[PDB]
Write a protein that holds these residues in place. Structure first.
Motif, short mmCIF file in Angstrom:
data_model
loop_
_atom_site.label_atom_id
_atom_site.label_comp_id
_atom_site.label_asym_id
_atom_site.label_seq_id
_atom_site.Cartn_x
_atom_site.Cartn_y
_atom_site.Cartn_z
N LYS A 42 0.88 -1.47 -0.05
CA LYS A 42 0.09 0.21 0.04
C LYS A 42 0.85 1.28 0.05
CE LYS A 42 -1.83 -1.15 3.93
NZ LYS A 42 -0.75 -2.11 4.59
N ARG A 43 2.21 1.18 -0.07
CA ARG A 43 3.01 2.35 -0.04
C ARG A 43 3.74 2.24 -1.40
NH1 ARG A 43 7.00 2.85 3.16
NH2 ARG A 43 6.63 5.01 2.90
N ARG A 45 3.23 2.65 -4.71
CA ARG A 45 2.46 1.90 -5.40
C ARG A 45 2.18 2.63 -6.95
NH1 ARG A 45 -0.47 -3.22 -4.80
NH2 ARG A 45 0.08 -4.14 -6.87
N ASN A 47 0.43 3.15 -10.08
CA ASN A 47 -1.11 3.29 -10.42
C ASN A 47 -1.40 3.81 -11.82
OD1 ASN A 47 -0.64 5.40 -9.33
ND2 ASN A 47 -2.57 5.66 -8.23
N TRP C 119 -10.60 8.49 -0.19
CA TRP C 119 -10.61 6.99 0.30
C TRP C 119 -10.19 6.11 -0.75
CZ3 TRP C 119 -15.89 8.80 2.57
CH2 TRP C 119 -15.55 9.02 4.00
N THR C 120 -8.94 5.95 -0.51
CA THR C 120 -8.36 4.74 -1.64
C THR C 120 -7.50 3.68 -0.92
OG1 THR C 120 -6.49 6.45 -2.09
CG2 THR C 120 -8.05 6.16 -3.90
N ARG C 121 -7.21 3.84 0.34
CA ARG C 121 -6.51 2.90 1.21
C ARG C 121 -5.26 2.37 0.35
NH1 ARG C 121 -11.93 1.41 3.97
NH2 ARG C 121 -12.86 1.07 1.65
N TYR C 122 -4.56 3.21 -0.18
CA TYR C 122 -3.17 3.15 -0.82
C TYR C 122 -2.61 4.38 -1.22
CZ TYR C 122 -4.73 3.81 -5.67
OH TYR C 122 -5.29 4.44 -6.73
N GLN C 123 -1.19 4.26 -0.98
CA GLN C 123 -0.52 5.72 -1.26
C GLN C 123 0.16 5.57 -2.60
OE1 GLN C 123 2.17 6.65 1.92
NE2 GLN C 123 0.52 5.49 3.73
N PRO C 124 -0.01 6.26 -3.58
CA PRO C 124 0.65 6.08 -4.95
C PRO C 124 2.22 6.69 -4.86
CG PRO C 124 -1.47 7.33 -5.15
CD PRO C 124 -1.02 7.38 -3.75
#
Ligand code: NDP
Ligand code: SF4
Ligand code: ZN
Lengths: 149, 71, 127, 158, 185, 330, 376, 99
Positions: A42-43, A45, A47, C119-124
């Motif tokens: 989750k870090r 990442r 996309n 609200w995505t529950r991930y960090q790009p």
């Protein structure tokens, strides 16, 4: 090792990783890295397909544009100086797809991570654990050369 | 901090963390306590027994109140 | 407020009912709470005059007097005010719900919220 | 645009809002088990006839549709057809939890997740079932909502 | 209780179709073949000492593991002798079982309900249209493999000026909580 | 870049926040419905009554359709409405005048204000503005001239702006077929204007909405283009009237009033509107601006981009679009 | 010709205003109750039975709890049994009052509606004092009840019983003996006992013909075998005799209520074992095992032994039955819900044959079709 | 009226023919039910029904044939009662990951 695990998730995110029984690989145990590697999913990442512009910064584009520019650059260069590198983690489907694509582009320079220049990869008995984990159970004397298990 | 700002956005009233840090530790003579939540055991939380051998205050883990041994 | 009786007719009923009543209390918002026992039916022996004749609302009753008015408790609002908790608590607010977007309640993801949270529950990667 | 014409317009709008508030003629859409509580609201204790509420069986004469009960995929077309026949000044009160967001049958086939998906509802009345007290509160809230309709002012300033 | 006419039936009923019997305080149970169910119910309804002349209901149970997944259950009552009886058979998706509308006229709507919920068709039903679900329903909701929320949902389409049916896109998906204890067995 | 986070349909993301100015009109319903079906969020800014966007609330998921009250003459209010916007759609415009709003004010000045605010707010990725097909600087109609000036100023101020030019749009809430049917039912005849020999290219409203959605979904091919939208075949006014009469199953009847007397009949409304302080009834048929627009043919120029260039074929106007006229039969 | 009426949809074939046949379409309130019950735990499925046959709330709770206890074999204390009987009879009074007054309104009599709603408001106040809400009160649970009676409830119920005897006399005086009421009811929708047995009628619709069979006496599932009440039967099954039977059932329900109030014992309100009944708040906050059992009973449920049973009770509409099939897990594998409206609405077809439209609506009112239970 | 299961392929074929006859006779009613006269092409509708029957030839179980005919008759009753070049891979790839 390919230790069998069970990934417990609540929605779109992985919440925890637990071991599961596989007597041939890992009886009931699991390493700290395997157990707690879920946090990195989750870090940092990626996309979105991105292209580095002339200024050096990344601009997000479509898959169509990214594939078009990659194909144009691949066609521009001669096939001799084209190299493909497989990552530390990669499935056989992706690796065979990469090999086939690069070969059809005219390049024979596809290699995986952690593989030396002159590696005699023509014998699975040469490059796998023939004794297996059960055989390691059955073993009596060990000679560990070049490895820190 | 991050957790409080994650569940609350008012950022003008006092969050429960600040109030529970402001309430002083409770000095008790004995080595063990019975933490119930309020004056009525039936209206509080399940009873929690807290060990007080460590010098630092011990959080109740229910209605955290920081009981501290007397001597 | 007696001139409101002619175009209200409901305040008129309340004033008719406050003939023999006894003012049992009054709250900080001005609402005057009346009780009337004796030859009165059960359902109509406690009531309130909201002291806001123009736009009186059913949600203007504070929680201190809500139970007494609804016959939950025999405790008047004064005792509950005495027992009101300290170190936390908010003043009573009516059910506006339509008096303004700045007044109504908005979710954290609603576009009308002053601060809208993703609200995505991930960090790009965020180059 | 002036200050005396504005006052006259405000008085006219106040009269119109008073009339529409005091003469609400809702129609029951009484499915499932908020309709019994609605009949309790229409009973002697929490009487609705005092405020001007009288139930009109014909949708052509009704003012606002009160949908009380569960909305089914088999009945939603009927609800929409009946709603479409109502006159242009119209309102909707969604009573209960089934007609709000599906309620206790939200995760179920042949259940509409609230009447909001079929008709534009103005006021929701939470509860399961909402007390007749609460339903009459919702009707008074509808009166309050239609008490701020500046139809004449909007028509004038176009 | 009142296991009198059950034992009397097993004493007098022909043994050809009694596949199995269960003597329980939760309800006496007969399980037979689908070929002889109509004859068995005709015998019970008409016999003078087993007069189960009222059909309580017809139910269906889905058992995906078995070859014949559907189990059709008939709860019957004898008011003259004051006792309940149960007669059930096993049917699959395609095979049609005999209908008992002629014996018990009330069986029509329960048989239509069984058709609606599971798909077990009946041989001699005067009609077998769907009764409970929406018009044009495609699946059989009470099957275990049928998803709880269904396949389609309805909404109002303004350009079409009608309520249209679209594939499900529901928010707040159903949260299945696995409470089962490993020590329950 | 917009990011899609769902399968599609209702209860999706689609990564688009579209502010639809003038969404309470005839085309606003369809464009907002298409946007909400896409899964995007729609900010509907409504002018007056709170029940104007009421229907628009039901076509989107929870919180997706957000109604905002504003003042069209208030730059701060417009900025506040467009604060969270990602793309902007402009449909504002009235077929007639009022003592407060003229054709120039309702089209040109408002388009200029929207373009200026969109340019100031750097987060806007798309600006789709709708005008008329016959919008030309030399067009006789004042409304068409104002719309042409508005489209020109939108192109000048914000080059990254797409301009749609649909022809007359027919539908359940249109303003031509419905008045014609009402007049035919009430009086037994409909007034043709200049014997009805002029030609138009009426276009179906859902087709226009789909065209706008495709324009929004374009992969950067229509940033600064103007798309002329029209029906499959050219219909004369008389042919459209005959189709209307056939759909209602009534006997056609025409008077064919000449243009000079039609203009004379429609003339006093403008001077009365400019004189009296109270509003006058809106001209459903006897509109001087409609007469001026009807003075010249309004069809595609064959040069500008059309439905074929955009990628969707127009719908034939016999059975799908005129199905609403059945309610007018008996 | 076919005439359509549109949650009651009904198509009637008419010749001379005479109803040749009537076909109801019922699915308009289908909600997947059985599927949801299969997908939810037993305690989470009790509110579904609250919602089914909503006019008579606690009768369905009683049936469901009896089925669960039959599949579970847990003893319910005498006080819990007596309060369950008391509130079941209160439920019967409520349902009979509503059925009679809605039938009277459909006929044309409008005034008894609001008097019986005053009585119903008193009874719903009883419900709200004893439990959470006026309607759909999840008060009856497997193994007992949710909570004990508040003090003063017995005195209030006694006062209500006296005033309600007066009210029943009042309503019977107004309705019974009226020439218009008799002309509306008598010889309307008559059913023979053979027809009722064939079509699976139950309750008043079955005792109207005079089968002389009641569930509370055939299979007493409570202290009913200690309450010596009366069960009325109809000489010639029709609307008038069914209405009179309902009046007599209201009177006997008052009788049973008084008997339960008089001989209610002092003890506990639920099953003694905490494996099946949740412990009290004080016990779970004070005792380690009680906390464990509260946690397990509110996350998981009681695992009933794998078995299938059909438990039926005398609901005010008629025989309400639940067919529960388990697999040893915490969720019911299958739950079939036999409501006494599904059969009566079938009976509508032959009941309203050769009658007229007003006779059809009178028959519907007499059968008292609640569409929630028929669309279970 | 529902009939017992067909015990022969010939009986199943006869039932299929009867169902196709019923569909053909009920086709003109659908015309006034739906009103798509512009591009209906009743002949094309008959061809599509025949094409559905012809794509359902892989079935050989008479029970499955009877069940399919029962569901087809049910669908017919419902319709009468008015109840409604970049290769395929690259398009799905550009659309979404799940394809
Ligand atoms: N005649 C036609 O149908 C055709 C129109 N066009 C073009 O498309 C545009 C949109 O058409 P359409 O949606 O069908 O028509 P509408 O008039 O119905 O839509 C305009 C919307 O903006 C609102 N509005 C009107 N005047 C003002 C104003 N001064 N300030 C703020 N809001 C205002 C309207 O009413 P409210 O204030 O209540 O929201 C309505 O919601 C037209 O202006 C025209 O240029 C092109 C071809 C054919
Ligand atoms: S919201 Fe509750 S009370 Fe109302 S119909 Fe639904 S289940 Fe019944
Ligand atoms: Zn504590």
């Amino acid at each position: 090792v390919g230790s069998n695990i069970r990934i417990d998730s609540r929605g779109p995110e992985v919440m925890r990783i637990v071991p599961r029984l596989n007597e041939d690989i890992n009886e009931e145990w699991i390493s700290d890295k395997t157990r707690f590697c879920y946090d990195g999913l989750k870090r940092q990442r990626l996309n979105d397909p991105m292209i580095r512009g002339p200024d050096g910064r990344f601009k997000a584009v479509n898959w169509r544009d990214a594939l078009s520019v990659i194909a144009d650059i691949a066609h521009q260069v001669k096939p001799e100086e084209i190299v493909g590198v497989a990552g530390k983690l990669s499935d056989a489907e992706s690796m065979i797809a990469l090999k086939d694509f690069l070969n059809r582009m005219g390049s024979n320079d596809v290699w995986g991570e952690g593989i030396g220049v002159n590696t005699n990869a023509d014998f699975r008995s040469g490059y796998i654990m023939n004794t297996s984990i059960a055989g390691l159970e059955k073993a009596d004397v060990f000679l560990l050369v070049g490895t820190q298990p | 901090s991050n957790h409080t700002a994650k569940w609350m956005q008012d950022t003008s009233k006092k969050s429960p963390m600040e109030l529970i840090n402001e309430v002083p530790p409770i000095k008790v003579e004995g080595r063990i306590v019975a933490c119930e939540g309020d004056t009525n055991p039936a209206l509080g939380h399940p009873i929690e027994f807290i060990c007080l051998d460590l010098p630092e205050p011990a959080v109740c883990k229910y209605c955290g109140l920081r009981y501290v041994q007397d001597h | 407020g007696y001139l409101r009786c002619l175009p209200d007719g409901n305040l008129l009923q309340t004033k008719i009912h406050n003939i023999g009543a006894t003012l049992v209390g009054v709250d900080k918002f001005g609402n005057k709470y009346y009780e009337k026992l004796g030859d009165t039916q059960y359902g109509r022996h406690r009531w309130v005059e909201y002291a806001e004749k123009s736009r009186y609302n059913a949600s203007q009753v504070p929680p201190e007097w809500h139970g007494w008015l609804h016959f939950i408790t025999d405790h008047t609002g004064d005792e509950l005010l005495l027992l009101k908790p300290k170190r936390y608590g908010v003043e009573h607010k009516e059910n506006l719900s339509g008096e303004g977007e700045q007044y109504i309640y908005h979710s954290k993801g609603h576009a009308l919220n002053p601060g809208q949270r993703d609200w995505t529950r991930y960090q790009p990667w965020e180059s | 645009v002036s200050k005396a014409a504005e006052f006259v317009i405000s008085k006219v709008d106040d009269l119109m809002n008073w009339a529409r508030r005091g003469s609400i003629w809702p129609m029951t859409f009484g499915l499932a088990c908020c309709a019994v509580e609605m009949m309790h609201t229409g009973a002697a204790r929490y009487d609705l006839d005092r405020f001007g509420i009288i139930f009109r069986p014909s949708p052509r004469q009704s003012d606002c549709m009160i949908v009380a009960g569960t909305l089914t995929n088999k009945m939603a077309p009927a609800l929409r057809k009946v709603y479409d026949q109502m006159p242009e000044p119209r309102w909707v009160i969604s009573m209960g939890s089934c007609a709000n967001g599906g309620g206790y049958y939200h995760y179920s086939y042949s259940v509409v997740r609230g009447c909001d998906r079929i008709v534009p509802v103005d006021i929701y009345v939470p509860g399961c079932p909402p007390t007749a007290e609460a339903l009459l509160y919702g009707l008074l809230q509808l009166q309050k909502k239609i008490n701020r309709r500046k139809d004449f002012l909007h028509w004038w300033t176009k | 209780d009142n296991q009198f006419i059950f034992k009397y039936s097993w004493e007098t009923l022909p043994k050809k179709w009694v596949k199995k019997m269960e003597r329980s305080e939760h309800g006496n149970r007969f399980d037979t073949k689908t070929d002889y169910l109509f004859q068995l119910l005709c015998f019970l309804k008409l016999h003078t000492y087993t007069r189960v002349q009222v059909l309580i209901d017809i139910c269906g149970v889905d058992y995906p593991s078995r070859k014949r997944r559907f189990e059709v259950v008939y709860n019957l009552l004898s008011t003259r002798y004051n006792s309940r009886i149960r007669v059930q058979t096993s049917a699959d998706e395609v095979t049609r079982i005999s209908s008992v509308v002629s014996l018990f006229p009330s069986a029509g709507w329960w048989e239509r309900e069984v058709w609606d919920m599971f798909g077990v068709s009946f041989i001699n039903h005067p009609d077998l249209r769907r009764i409970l679900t929406d018009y044009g329903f495609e699946g059989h909701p009470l099957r275990k493999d049928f998803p709880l929320s269904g396949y389609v949902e309805v909404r109002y389409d303004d350009p079409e000026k009608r309520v249209v049916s679209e594939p499900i896109e529901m928010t707040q998906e159903f949260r299945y909580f696995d409470f089962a204890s490993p020590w329950e067995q | 870049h917009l990011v899609r986070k769902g399968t599609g349909g209702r209860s999706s993301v689609s990564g688009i926040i579209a502010t639809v100015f003038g969404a309470t009109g005839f085309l606003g319903r369809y464009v907002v419905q298409q946007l909400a079906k896409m899964g995007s969020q729609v900010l509907v800014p409504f002018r007056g009554s709170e029940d104007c966007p009421r229907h628009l609330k039901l076509m989107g998921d929870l919180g997706q359709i957000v109604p905002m009250k504003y003042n069209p003459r208030d730059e701060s209010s417009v900025k506040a409405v467009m604060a969270k916007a990602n793309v902007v759609i402009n449909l504002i415009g009235r077929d007639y005048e009022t003592r407060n709003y003229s054709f120039e004010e309702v089209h040109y000045h408002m388009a200029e204000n929207l373009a200026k605010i969109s340019r100031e707010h750097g987060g806007i990725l798309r600006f789709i503005q709708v005008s008329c097909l016959g919008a030309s600087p030399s067009s006789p109609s004042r409304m068409l001239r104002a719309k042409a000036a508005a489209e020109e100023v939108v192109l000048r101020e914000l080059p990254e702006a797409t301009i749609l030019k649909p022809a007359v749009m027919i539908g359940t809430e249109d303003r031509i077929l419905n008045p014609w049917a009402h007049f035919a039912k009430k009086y037994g005849f409909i007034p043709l204007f200049g014997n009805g020999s002029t030609k138009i290219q009426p276009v179906y409203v859902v087709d226009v909405a789909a065209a706008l959605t495709t324009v929004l979904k374009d992969d950067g091919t229509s940033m600064g283009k103007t798309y002329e939208l029209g029906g499959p075949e050219i219909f004369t006014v008389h042919d459209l009237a005959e189709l209307m009469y056939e759909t209602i199953r009534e006997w056609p009847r025409y008077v064919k009033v000449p243009f000079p007397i039609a203009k004379a009949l429609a003339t006093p409304r403008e001077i009365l509107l400019n004189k009296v302080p109270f509003p006058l009834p809106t001209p459903e048929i006897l509109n001087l601006d409609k007469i001026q627009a009807l003075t010249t043919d309004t069809i595609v120029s064959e040069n500008a981009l059309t439905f074929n260039d955009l990628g969707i074929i127009p719908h034939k106007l016999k059975g799908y679009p005129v199905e609403f006229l059945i309610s007018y039969r008996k | 010709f076919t005439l359509n009426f549109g949650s009651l949809r009904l198509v009637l074939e008419m010749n001379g205003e005479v109803v040749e046949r009537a076909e109801p379409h019922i699915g308009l309130l289908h909600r997947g109750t059985e599927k949801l019950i299969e997908y939810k735990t037993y305690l989470q499925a009790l509110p579904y039975f609250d919602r089914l046959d909503y006019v008579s709330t606690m009768a369905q709770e009683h049936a469901y709890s009896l089925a669960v206890e039959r599949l579970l074999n847990c003893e319910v204390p005498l006080r819990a049994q007596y309060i369950r009987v008391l509130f079941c009879e209160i439920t019967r009074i409520l349902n009979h009052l509503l059925a009679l007054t809605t039938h009277a309104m459909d006929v044309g009599a409008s005034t008894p509606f609001l008097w019986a709603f005053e009585e119903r408001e008193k009874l719903l106040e009883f419900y709200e004092r004893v439990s959470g809400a006026r309607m759909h009160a999840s008060f009856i649970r497997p193994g007992g009840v949710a909570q004990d009676l508040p003090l003063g409830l017995c005195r209030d119920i006694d006062s209500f019983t006296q005033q309600f005897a007066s009210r029943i006399d009042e309503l019977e005086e107004m309705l019974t003996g009226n020439r218009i009421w008799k002309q509306r009811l008598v010889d309307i929708g008559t059913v023979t006992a053979q027809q009722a047995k064939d079509w699976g009628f139950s309750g008043v619709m079955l005792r109207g013909p005079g089968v002389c069979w009641d569930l509370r006496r055939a299979a007493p599932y409570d202290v009913y075998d200690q309450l010596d009440f009366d069960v009325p039967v109809g000489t010639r099954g029709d609307c008038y005799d069914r209405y009179c039977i309902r009046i007599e059932e209201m009177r006997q329900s008052m009788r049973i209520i008084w008997q339960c109030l008089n001989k209610i014992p002092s003890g506990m309100i639920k099953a003694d074992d905490r494996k099946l009944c949740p412990p009290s708040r004080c016990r779970m906050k004070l005792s380690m095992e009680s906390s464990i059992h509260h946690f397990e009973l509110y996350t998981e449920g009681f695992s009933v032994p794998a078995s299938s049973t059909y438990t039926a009770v005398e609901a005010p509409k008629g025989e309400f039955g639940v067919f529960l099939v388990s697999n040893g897990s915490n969720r019911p594998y299958r739950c079939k819900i036999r409501a006494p409206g599904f059969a009566h609405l079938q009976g509508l077809d032959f009941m309203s044959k050769h009658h007229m439209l007003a006779d059809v609506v009178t028959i519907i009112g007499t059968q008292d079709i609640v569409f929630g239970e028929v669309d279970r | 009226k529902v009939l017992p299961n067909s015990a022969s392929v010939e009986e199943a074929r006869q039932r299929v023919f009867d169902f196709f006859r019923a569909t053909c006779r009920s086709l003109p009613s659908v015309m006034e039910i739906y009103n798509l006269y512009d591009v209906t092409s009743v002949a094309q509708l008959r061809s599509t029904v025949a094409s559905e029957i012809r794509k359902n030839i892989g079935v050989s179980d008479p029970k499955v044939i009877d069940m399919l005919l029962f569901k087809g008759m049910e669908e017919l009753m419902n319709v009468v009662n008015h109840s409604k070049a970049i290769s395929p891979f690259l398009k799905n790839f550009y659309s979404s990951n799940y394809f």
